[PDB]
Write a protein that binds this ligand. Sequence first.
Ligand SMILES: [Mg+2]
Ligand SMILES: [Mg+2]
Ligand SMILES: [Mg+2]
Ligand SMILES: [Mg+2]
Ligand SMILES: [Mg+2]
Ligand SMILES: [Mg+2]
Ligand SMILES: [Mg+2]
Ligand SMILES: [Mg+2]
Ligand SMILES: [Mg+2]
Ligand SMILES: [Mg+2]
Ligand SMILES: [Mg+2]
Ligand SMILES: [Mg+2]
Ligand SMILES: [Mg+2]
Ligand SMILES: [Mg+2]
Ligand SMILES: [Mg+2]
Ligand SMILES: [Mg+2]
Ligand SMILES: [Mg+2]
Ligand SMILES: [Zn+2]
Lengths: 177, 116, 66, 83
Amino acid sequence: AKLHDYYKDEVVKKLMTEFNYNSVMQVPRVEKITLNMGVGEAIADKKLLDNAAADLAAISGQKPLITKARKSVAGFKIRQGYPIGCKVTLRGERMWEFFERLITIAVPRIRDFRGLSAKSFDGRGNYSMGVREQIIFPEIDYDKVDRVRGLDITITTTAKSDEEGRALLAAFDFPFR
Amino acid sequence: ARIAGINIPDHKHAVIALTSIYGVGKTRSKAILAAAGIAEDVKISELSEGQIDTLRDEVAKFVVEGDLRREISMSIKRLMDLGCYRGLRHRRGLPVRGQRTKTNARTRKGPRKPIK
Amino acid sequence: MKKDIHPKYEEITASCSCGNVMKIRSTVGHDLNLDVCSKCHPFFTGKQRDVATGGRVDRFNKRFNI
Amino acid sequence: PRSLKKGPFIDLHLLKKVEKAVESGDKKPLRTWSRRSTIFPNMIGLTIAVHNGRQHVPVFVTDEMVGHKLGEFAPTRTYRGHA
RNA sequence: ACGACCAGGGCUACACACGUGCUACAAUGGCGCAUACAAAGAGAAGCGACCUCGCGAGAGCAAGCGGACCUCAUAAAGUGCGUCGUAGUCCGGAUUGGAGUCUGCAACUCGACUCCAUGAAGUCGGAAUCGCUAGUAAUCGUGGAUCAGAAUGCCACGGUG
RNA sequence: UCCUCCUAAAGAGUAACGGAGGAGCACGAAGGUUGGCUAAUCCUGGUCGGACAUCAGGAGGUUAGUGCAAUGGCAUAAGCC
Ligand SMILES: [Mg+2]
Ligand SMILES: [Mg+2]
Ligand SMILES: [Mg+2]
Ligand SMILES: [Mg+2]
Ligand SMILES: [Mg+2]
Ligand SMILES: [Mg+2]
Ligand SMILES: [Mg+2]
Ligand SMILES: [Mg+2]
Ligand SMILES: [Mg+2]
Ligand SMILES: [Mg+2]
Ligand SMILES: [Mg+2]
Ligand SMILES: [Mg+2]
Ligand SMILES: [Mg+2]
Ligand SMILES: [Mg+2]
Ligand SMILES: [Mg+2]
Ligand SMILES: [Mg+2]
Ligand SMILES: [Mg+2]
Ligand SMILES: [Zn+2]
């Protein structure tokens, strides 16, 4: 809750000035962070899912919700009901502490990190990014793992416009460009 | 054991395990360890973390993993955009340096393409 | 949160080569030594240099004098 | 490549034509058989028609085209494919 | 003009098929340091010490030599020690990028060499097929002709055997 | 033989070698109850990931769903945990 403490005193004072909001409730705020691993190759065996869910449980310290197919499609050879991915929703204090560890540790540990995109805000403020490799988090031991996974991070916020979420992450020095 | 972005094996010796970095070889690995004062026969194991901090600074003097692949691709795409003879060889998939294309161009042309 | 299903989530210390001592809550357990943090990553100085286009005329005039 | 102590290379009959077309300011295509002449930075922006063995292909001179020779932008073998 | 002169191009192209070779796929080896033993040749528009400079190919100054004198020119395999420890590896070197040297009016097509980086295929080869009976095969370096420059070819030479 | 729609003329019923489709089961939960939940599709953003898996937002408002044919129902859901 270090950044949550950092949110409540200086980010709110910053955004109220540069947007001239009438109320303090009118400010944006982050709401949840969703950690998906679409593991489409787990239809061969459960153990790839069972270890990828084990890896994402180490990144964010929650047991992941194993997601399933909403319907059946034949291009991917899946039926409605097959376990096909895993997610973690992060809210409250656990949202901020992962968000602290993300932009301070794991984003510098990206190989050939050169910035993010400012064109990834889904028209309505909600930001989504995808990492290539789970080794950028220091939770994963390099010798103990064998397979390079990938996950994607989705920050869902209360910003109405598209730029207001872009200004919100910039108050947390989110490395756009 | 994590230099310039990538990891480096511990069981190998010092000069060999440095060469896993895209941008250094057996020559430049001797140049790194001489400037760090580190013997070459030691492993990446039993190194002080201050020595590895000395090691990261010496590698950071040169052009490595993320920079070099960008520079190599920039040089090739410079030839691509001009349309010189070296650019056409780079984009026909043919050898650039003036080798024979009648026989034994299999590195640039891949495996054999049978006439169907 | 539920009681048993979650992994152990404990506050540890992560130090870096620039000496940025930072205490985070994590699932590592043992202490952590980092390599680059957001304070010392060369995103704000180093990545600007790393484009490095270079001039073709400037390469030509450097090699000699007329 | 050539040694640095010799500097670059350009034909005299080409180098006089470059010197004329700069001062005259004409943008006529200069037909030229000097495929072995290094392009100079004062040649930038000129249409110069390098020979290829059969005809004269016009080459507009770019900033990046300085450190090369004129024959690289006049390919001599026409090849389209076997099938 | 089917004769003659010049510039530029081509003889070096490239879905492919074959011949002849070179280097490999490593531990009877790679590497690093130290160290022992050859023969046969070439040299004046040439061979070019020594010394200096360069990581280097080389550069500068420059002796000596038409040569049992001097120079090309330190033979390598070997041995001694250390190292890797079976991996696509400290094996293999293709390819490609950058930087160069030298030759030559001139190295783009289209030269050789060096340096830094890159690190393909390849883990002994289907049917088939070749050479060889002793200083032979196998392997290891050396030199010459042609030649401004430009060989894994060719012609010679000795080592181990 | 049995079910559904039309013919069938706004109650029921109504024929033809009239027009169209199904059934000869399944389920020990796919039953009972309590509690809770709400679709299809499309748009944008996002590691592998692609027309199409999963994730996050928005439009949409049942165009979905119903063990199976059709018809009538179905949000208090009879749909889904
Ligand atoms: Mg390397
Ligand atoms: Mg090399
Ligand atoms: Mg001619
Ligand atoms: Mg020929
Ligand atoms: Mg000779
Ligand atoms: Mg020296
Ligand atoms: Mg030896
Ligand atoms: Mg050895
Ligand atoms: Mg090697
Ligand atoms: Mg292979
Ligand atoms: Mg092997
Ligand atoms: Mg006989
Ligand atoms: Mg010669
Ligand atoms: Mg009726
Ligand atoms: Mg009636
Ligand atoms: Mg039912
Ligand atoms: Mg109910
Ligand atoms: Zn730091």
